[PDB]
Amino acid sequence: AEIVLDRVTKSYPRAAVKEFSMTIADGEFIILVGPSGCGKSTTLNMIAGLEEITSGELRIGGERVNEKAPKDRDIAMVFQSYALYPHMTVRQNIAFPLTLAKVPKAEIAAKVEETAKILDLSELLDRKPGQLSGGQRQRVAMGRAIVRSPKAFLMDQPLSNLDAKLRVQMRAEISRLQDRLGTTTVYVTHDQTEAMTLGDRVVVMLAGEVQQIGTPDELYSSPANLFVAGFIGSPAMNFFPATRTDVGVRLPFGEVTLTPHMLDLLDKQARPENIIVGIRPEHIEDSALLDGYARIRALTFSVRADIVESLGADKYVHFTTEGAGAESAQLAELAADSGAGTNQFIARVSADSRVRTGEQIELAIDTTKLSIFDAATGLNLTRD
Amino acid sequence: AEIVLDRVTKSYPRAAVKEFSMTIADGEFIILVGPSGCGKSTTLNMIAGLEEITSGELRIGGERVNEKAPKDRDIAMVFQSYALYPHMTVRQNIAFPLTLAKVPKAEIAAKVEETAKILDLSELLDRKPGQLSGGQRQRVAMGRAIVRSPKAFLMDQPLSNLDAKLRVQMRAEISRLQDRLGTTTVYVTHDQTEAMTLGDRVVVMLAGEVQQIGTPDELYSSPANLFVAGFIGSPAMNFFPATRTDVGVRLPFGEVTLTPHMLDLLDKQARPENIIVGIRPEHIEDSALLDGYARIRALTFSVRADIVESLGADKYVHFTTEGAGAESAQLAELAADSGAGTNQFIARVSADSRVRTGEQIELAIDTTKLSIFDAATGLNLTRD
Amino acid sequence: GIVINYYTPANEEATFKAVANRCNEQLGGRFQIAQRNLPKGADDQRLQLARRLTGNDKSLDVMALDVVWTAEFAEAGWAVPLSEDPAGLAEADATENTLPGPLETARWQDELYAAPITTNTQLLWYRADLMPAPPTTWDGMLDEANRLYREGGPSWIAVQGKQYEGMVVWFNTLLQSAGGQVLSDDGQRVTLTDTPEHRAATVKALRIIKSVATAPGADPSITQTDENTARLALEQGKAALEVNWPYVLPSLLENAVKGGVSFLPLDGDPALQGSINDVGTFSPTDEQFDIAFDASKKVFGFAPYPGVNPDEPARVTLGGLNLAVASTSQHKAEAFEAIRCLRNVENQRYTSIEGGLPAVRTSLYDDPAFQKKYPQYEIIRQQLTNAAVRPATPVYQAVSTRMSATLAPISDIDPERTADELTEAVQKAIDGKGLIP
Amino acid sequence: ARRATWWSVVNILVIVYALIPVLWILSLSLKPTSSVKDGKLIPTEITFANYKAIFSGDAFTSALFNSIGIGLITTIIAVVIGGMAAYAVARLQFPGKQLLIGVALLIAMFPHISLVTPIFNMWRGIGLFDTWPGLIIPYITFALPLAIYTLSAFFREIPWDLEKAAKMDGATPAQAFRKVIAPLAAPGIVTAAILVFIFAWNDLLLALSLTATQRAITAPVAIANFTGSSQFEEPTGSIAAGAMVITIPIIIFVLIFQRRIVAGLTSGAV
Amino acid sequence: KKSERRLAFWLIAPAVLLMLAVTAYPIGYAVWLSLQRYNLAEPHDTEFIGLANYVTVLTDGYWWTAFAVTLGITVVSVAIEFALGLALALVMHRTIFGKGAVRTAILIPYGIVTVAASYSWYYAWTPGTGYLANLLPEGSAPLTDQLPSLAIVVLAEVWKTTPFMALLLLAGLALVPQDLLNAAQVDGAGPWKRLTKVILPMIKPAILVALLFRTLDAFRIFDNIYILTGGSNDTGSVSILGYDNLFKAFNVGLGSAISVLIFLSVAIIAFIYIKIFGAAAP
Numbered sequence A, B: 001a002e003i004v005l006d007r008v009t010k011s012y013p014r015a016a017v018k019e020f021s022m023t024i025a026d027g028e029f030i031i032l033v034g035p036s037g038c039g040k041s042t043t044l045n046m047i048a049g050l051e052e053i054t055s056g057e058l059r060i061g062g063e064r065v066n067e068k069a070p071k072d073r074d075i076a077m078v079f080q081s082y083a084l085y086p087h088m089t090v091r092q093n094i095a096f097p098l099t100l101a102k103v104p105k106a107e108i109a110a111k112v113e114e115t116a117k118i119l120d121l122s123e124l125l126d127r128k129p130g131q132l133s134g135g136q137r138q139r140v141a142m143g144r145a146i147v148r149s150p151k152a153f154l155m156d157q158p159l160s161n162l163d164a165k166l167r168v169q170m171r172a173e174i175s176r177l178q179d180r181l182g183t184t185t186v187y188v189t190h191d192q193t194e195a196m197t198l199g200d201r202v203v204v205m206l207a208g209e210v211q212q213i214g215t216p217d218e219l220y221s222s223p224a225n226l227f228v229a230g231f232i233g234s235p236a237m238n239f240f241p242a243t244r245t246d247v248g249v250r251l252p253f254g255e256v257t258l259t260p261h262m263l264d265l266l267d268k269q270a271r272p273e274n275i276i277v278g279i280r281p282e283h284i285e286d287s288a289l290l291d292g293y294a295r296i297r298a299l300t301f302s303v304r305a306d307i308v309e310s311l312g313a314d315k316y317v318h319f320t321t322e323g324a325g326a327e328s329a330q331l332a333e334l335a336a337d338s339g340a341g342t343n344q345f346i347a348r349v350s351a352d353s354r355v356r357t358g359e360q361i362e363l364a365i366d367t368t369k370l371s372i373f374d375a376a377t378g379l380n381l382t383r384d
Numbered sequence C: 001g002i003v004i005n006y007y008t009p010a011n012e013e014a015t016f017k018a019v020a021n022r023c024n025e026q027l028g029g030r031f032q033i034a035q036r037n038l039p040k041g042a043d044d045q046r047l048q049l050a051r052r053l054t055g056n057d058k059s060l061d062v063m064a065l066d067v068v069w070t071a072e073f074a075e076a077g078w079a080v081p082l083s084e085d086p087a088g089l090a091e092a093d094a095t096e097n098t099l100p101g102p103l104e105t106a107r108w109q110d111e112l113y114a115a116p117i118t119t120n121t122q123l124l125w126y127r128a129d130l131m132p133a134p135p136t137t138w139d140g141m142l143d144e145a146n147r148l149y150r151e152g153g154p155s156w157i158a159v160q161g162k163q164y165e166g167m168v169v170w171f172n173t174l175l176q177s178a179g180g181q182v183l184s185d186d187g188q189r190v191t192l193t194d195t196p197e198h199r200a201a202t203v204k205a206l207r208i209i210k211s212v213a214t215a216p217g218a219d220p221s222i223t224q225t226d227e228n229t230a231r232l233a234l235e236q237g238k239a240a241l242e243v244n245w246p247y248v249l250p251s252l253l254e255n256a257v258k259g260g261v262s263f264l265p266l267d268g269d270p271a272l273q274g275s276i277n278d279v280g281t282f283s284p285t286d287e288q289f290d291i292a293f294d295a296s297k298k299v300f301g302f303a304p305y306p307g308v309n310p311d312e313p314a315r316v317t318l319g320g321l322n323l324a325v326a327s328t329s330q331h332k333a334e335a336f337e338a339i340r341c342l343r344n345v346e347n348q349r350y351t352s353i354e355g356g357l358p359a360v361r362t363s364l365y366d367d368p369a370f371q372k373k374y375p376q377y378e379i380i381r382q383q384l385t386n387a388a389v390r391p392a393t394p395v396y397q398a399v400s401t402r403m404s405a406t407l408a409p410i411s412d413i414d415p416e417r418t419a420d421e422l423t424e425a426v427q428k429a430i431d432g433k434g435l436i437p
Numbered sequence D: 001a002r003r004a005t006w007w008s009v010v011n012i013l014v015i016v017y018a019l020i021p022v023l024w025i026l027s028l029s030l031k032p033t034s035s036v037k038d039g040k041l042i043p044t045e046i047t048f049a050n051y052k053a054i055f056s057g058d059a060f061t062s063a064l065f066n067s068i069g070i071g072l073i074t075t076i077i078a079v080v081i082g083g084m085a086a087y088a089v090a091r092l093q094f095p096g097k098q099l100l101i102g103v104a105l106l107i108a109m110f111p112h113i114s115l116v117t118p119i120f121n122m123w124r125g126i127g128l129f130d131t132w133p134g135l136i137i138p139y140i141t142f143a144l145p146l147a148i149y150t151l152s153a154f155f156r157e158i159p160w161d162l163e164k165a166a167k168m169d170g171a172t173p174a175q176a177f178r179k180v181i182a183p184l185a186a187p188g189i190v191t192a193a194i195l196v197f198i199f200a201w202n203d204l205l206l207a208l209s210l211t212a213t214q215r216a217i218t219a220p221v222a223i224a225n226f227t228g229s230s231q232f233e234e235p236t237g238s239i240a241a242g243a244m245v246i247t248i249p250i251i252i253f254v255l256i257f258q259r260r261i262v263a264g265l266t267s268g269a270v
Numbered sequence E: 001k002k003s004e005r006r007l008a009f010w011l012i013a014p015a016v017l018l019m020l021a022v023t024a025y026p027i028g029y030a031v032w033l034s035l036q037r038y039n040l041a042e043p044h045d046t047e048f049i050g051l052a053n054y055v056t057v058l059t060d061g062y063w064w065t066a067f068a069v070t071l072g073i074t075v076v077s078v079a080i081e082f083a084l085g086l087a088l089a090l091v092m093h094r095t096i097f098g099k100g101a102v103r104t105a106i107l108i109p110y111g112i113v114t115v116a117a118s119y120s121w122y123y124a125w126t127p128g129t130g131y132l133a134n135l136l137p138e139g140s141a142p143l144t145d146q147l148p149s150l151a152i153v154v155l156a157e158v159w160k161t162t163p164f165m166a167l168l169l170l171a172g173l174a175l176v177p178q179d180l181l182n183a184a185q186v187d188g189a190g191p192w193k194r195l196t197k198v199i200l201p202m203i204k205p206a207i208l209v210a211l212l213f214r215t216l217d218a219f220r221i222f223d224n225i226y227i228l229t230g231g232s233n234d235t236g237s238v239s240i241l242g243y244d245n246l247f248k249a250f251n252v253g254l255g256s257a258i259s260v261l262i263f264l265s266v267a268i269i270a271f272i273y274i275k276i277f278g279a280a281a282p
């Protein structure tokens, strides 16, 4: 079945979950996102039935979730600590759920062999936790969820203690086997990239409030507010400081007019003169082969790339751009996520670009595909 | 001053360095890289003199430097732990190296004030390490090195235990500090992206020995072996199974008659037959707006989407290759980092690609920047 | 059965076990004597009982005790006088044929708090292997040590030199042959210098003490001496004389028949072999006794102790053991009857004979088998009639340690000083004052 | 090369520094009445008779029994009261256990004899003059702190988040408890029980005063009084044999428990 | 909150009651006994009030000297004990090979019944018989003659305690990061100066409690004196003086007073280590 909640609130001595409402369709591999110390582990504890509820009466599909025994919820979960049993072999650990459920030995034996072969860990089922890698241990904890065939699955950042090279393999495993399971399945993480890497739909929260829910490309293209826009993409969309002229910007950098339909869409509620745009660094290029239709709106203007780095097919370049308009609560708490100054930006420019460190060079921008955001209101004026 | 060594080995029950010989000029910001266990952190131990000599000799300027003069080697190094002494304030900790160097107390005080103004640190000189943030503590560990203004500074994984945002921001600090100092500086890492952030020269090694050493773009563009070709970049080249024809190469789909000079370069050696193709995933696209000279050599074939995600400028699309002929010791030991399977590959196609998961889709290759390797020796036929 | 524990020093337990068995036969199984076996150490034995008493251990039954501390045990009510025994006989029994001095010694404030059972004094026990006759004067003892040492002969003479009661007792004997006494006959006043002549006798004894502390060819190791080692010196022939209890005779005869007595290797004799029985214990026929006895007379003689003055009979300090029923005792009347049966004439016989040590019934002086069993008995009777005795004093134990403390500093024996020093100490002892050294 | 052999030499000197005097004791138990330091190395005649001589001493055999039994009862009581008060480290009440549990360690250091006097006075008043509880209660009082402290060291490791894993799994709280909590804790208990037994059994200052009956005398005090009823003041190879049989128990304990017991004492440096 | 708080009170109460009962009434009955001047040999002869009873003992030179020799014994013992304790803990930590067997070697002498060791140290020093004693010239016998025997007391007893100090001190060497030592040894301090300047401050709290225990446990000693001498050569410690009262004097007032004075005497040194040096438990 689906799983759903409404009005969900939890209140420590201070409001780590607040009024939340949702449902997840079955087989959905939903990705859950927020800063560390958002309501993540608390809502997980509430979904486990262990946490107390200030308000709400959720449904684990076919039962009142706020109103029933926790083991009787018939779910599974894996902790970021990898809770594990040093007084057991891996085989005995894999049997822990089955033996908890009084499962007959021959069935239990077939079940552990199956999940151990869904892992690679069938090579060492006789080993105890004293002789496993952290990744082998993590997978084993994954198996400790998997073998029970629950109604639903929860993942409290399981990838976290693997290195990146392990973590990408884990992301693929989680995906394929959640697909192979077809269960309602949830994962929570602090980084944006894993939520880009996997999950049908995505949900994002701050201070116990659910901020947005949607497909990750809608989040990638119409994030409702500057903070939830900034929390996604590691080369975040450059919030170049700006002020409105009723035709575009009173440009501190560039020279941009706004295209007439996008302008008359903005004009419907253009109350703030203080505004900002999400300059995605991938918009920003050296004009190296720009002939034809790309000439019409290139709006190219100079900055002096502080540094450039040949990461791949893009050789990212850092630059700075002075101005006024990029001041807000959303931007300040984005800078509390990590600080970088006020004018400092990057272009995701093509690595064949002629740019060498320590020169002023003219950066072109595909300005027809910029967003617009209320600097005063803290919200995306272009879309949600 | 400059860094040099020759015939360096240390041996443990075996050779953690295989008689290494190399140098880097004075005032440099060099980087060293390899997989865990390759001896890399060991080499730093040998440079510290805290690792002894089986063979070979060294200098940092001057000559023949021993292992019983670590403090007389004019070097300093923040450890992989960022550890520092809690028995003190930050001020006492930063003074500890200089005061132990018998610096007169007022100069010691001025020198720590200089460093504490150079770093983010003067505000917490009175705090002990028991009451610092992980970032300010990491900064303090830098302080504990740079206070010596050493003849070399040796960064042993000082920026890897932070989060991603902290790590890249620390890379900008490290840059501006090495720039501000102009002194000979080394960093060492278990990943390529650290050196991709910066490295005025870059070195990569395996099993106690150097495999390539030079400017980061040559390292990126012309790998000396399958090992280094796999280590460079996050989307490693899809080293597809193939065979050598007297006109080019038989790849599993989109196989090619090779351009005549590259072909006669391939024909310059009589022995090669078993060969594999360097499918660098970013060199791959949809034809849907490919209106240019590349259409002379699209070499396209239909490939199945195991998964695709619009993760940024690119749709990363997972697939798998056909046939067999890409199995080797270098491929296997390079595949020790993650679950690479047997033919599993990705294309980094532009994200405006009108494509979905599960379907089979005609995929176009920039063969103008394709490449080739010799499968038994495990090195590029295409470049060096 | 109804066990009566005979708590005693363990040293003679075999005798006590065999006689207790003979008594348990005689009791017809009504109640059973059983040996509770106290430390060889005197004080320890004496003060281990104080623990069991203070806790009122219900297993505490019949306690042997040395005559001295009886006043304290009576004053504290730890045993009941012979008038209170519900058998009625016990007072009359302890009165009947008991020798006078011991009977008087049990009479705390004239009340017999306990019954006497055995007694001892130290002999001038002289080897005839070198010396012609024993020195009957303590200065004569210095002269014989000097002579024998000048001869390079068996020059040592054996004495109770260590810091415990034996040194104090020896001193008390020396002092009272010099007419001196430690406290008044009531205990109501120190008397070591209550006359300047008592002071003179005290420092005269102190001069004697310092002189025997350094006499020519004495025991070189006398600093810690006790009867074990003291006998060892004489029977090895290192000494020519022993100042020791009557136990010297039977233990020497046993060791002669072990062959260890250097001048009397009676182990060579087939009548004396096997007289040492399966438990190594000399158990003679009348022939084996007379043979060993004659061979001992040929090379040894017991005598009265050396006088503190020329031709003055030594007032040797009397010693002995009394039996008392502890006020813990459940079978108290039965215990009184058990005390009576250990007092019986065949027990007195057995303890003098198999036990080898002086019983207290006077009538045995008239028995040729007792005169055989203790040839010294008449010297014992005379010296007992002449004896010095320690003052009946509840604080005696503490007083004697206070006295002992003064002796300790052997290196400096200032007669005039130490006599005033110990006078202060025994005043403080009578005063009951101070944290005890 | 040479530095390792040099270290091994330092190690051998430590093992000698330990093994020597107890070896002097054990070997001295076998002397043929030599009494003269001849048995320095490989005694002339290994005189077995001391073994049967001490075994014939049924006062000693009862004192041994008394000591073992009073050891077992005190470790049991001390563990069961101590553990369930080393617990309440999962609890942490407002008052502040940690700040006040200071006394526990302070009274572990307390001078026994200072309370031995009033204790003995009380036992002189009450019926418990030198019955078993007259040891057991006082002994428990000096066992108590080290028991609390050492169980608290395991319970500072006791990962209470495994209860969240258990609750998330299908097992009932009791079902999980009896198949994880006890399995984890048991080495911590048994080593603490052995430890407090060892620390109890070595005690003498109280026992050598608050006791005299054959019913309550213990092996240490009995061995100390083996000067009595020795044949001819020979508490010599006999008392040495007594020490040997007391100490074999310690050896056969510690040679098994070594790795575990150091973890207990160090509170974590296994 | 109050649910768990009341639960914790009920859970801790049995041990709290036990430790209280087995201490409070004893100390009370002692203080009551002091000035209630009385003797077990004088069973009805109780003074109903004895002011300055303890001042008799406090005035006695024999007490004051007995007090002094206990301290003289302890502090010397503690000093060499500490020096050996760290030396052992260092070796036991930094072993080239034998760390398990060395752990066995360390524990065995600690785990001993203390009277056994006391008798060992009593015979090795008896003349003629003693495997150590015979190496002296004639007339020596170091068990005798007061001060020479105190050297044997110290030797005998620190050999008995030392592994426990080493175990407790190893907590310092265990917590310190090895790379912290490598960083330190990767500087300008010669090994001894480096090791001391770096390790000592990290060792501080373990050092404090080790000294706190070793001080008190040495101070309330008895066995290694009594089971080696009777206190007879004026070798009498505080403890043997304390015991002799209940052994011989039977003045329960005196026995109390010395017991109480013993309690104050630990109370001050505990208060110093705790408050003046700042010592506190793990």
Ligand SMILES: Nc1ncnc2c1ncn2[C@@H]1O[C@H](COP(=O)(O)OP(=O)(O)OP(=O)(O)O)[C@@H](O)[C@H]1O
Pocket: A012, A013, A014, A016, A034, A035, A036, A037, A038, A039, A040, A041, A042, A043, A190
């Ligand atoms: N028992 C508690 N008492 C008081 N505050 C709490 C308690 N538990 C959690 N909080 C607070 O509520 C917030 C929510 O924590 P939650 O467990 O939901 O996520 P987290 O574990 O802190 O971080 P993440 O889940 O992202 O790893 C936290 O920031 C925390 O400070």
Ligand SMILES: Nc1ncnc2c1ncn2[C@@H]1O[C@H](COP(=O)(O)OP(=O)(O)OP(=O)(O)O)[C@@H](O)[C@H]1O
Pocket: B012, B013, B016, B034, B035, B036, B037, B038, B039, B040, B041, B042, B189, B190
């Ligand atoms: N002193 C030593 N004795 C024996 N082997 C050693 C020693 N030091 C290192 N090694 C070997 O090196 C390997 C550990 O890797 P290394 O020494 O390079 O440190 P590292 O931290 O793994 O390096 P990096 O972090 O750069 O990968 C081990 O597998 C071990 O066999």
Ligand SMILES: OC[C@H]1O[C@H](O[C@H]2O[C@H](CO)[C@@H](O)[C@H](O)[C@H]2O)[C@H](O)[C@@H](O)[C@@H]1O
Pocket: C009, C011, C040, C041, C042, C043, C066, C120, C164, C165, C166, C167, C169, C245, C247, C318, C319, C320
């Ligand atoms: O005769 C054997 C007894 O010797 C010791 O008692 C004697 O020696 C004491 C002095 O040390 C005297 O006080 C005592 O009067 C003597 O009888 C020993 O204490 C006794 O147990 C022996 O029976």
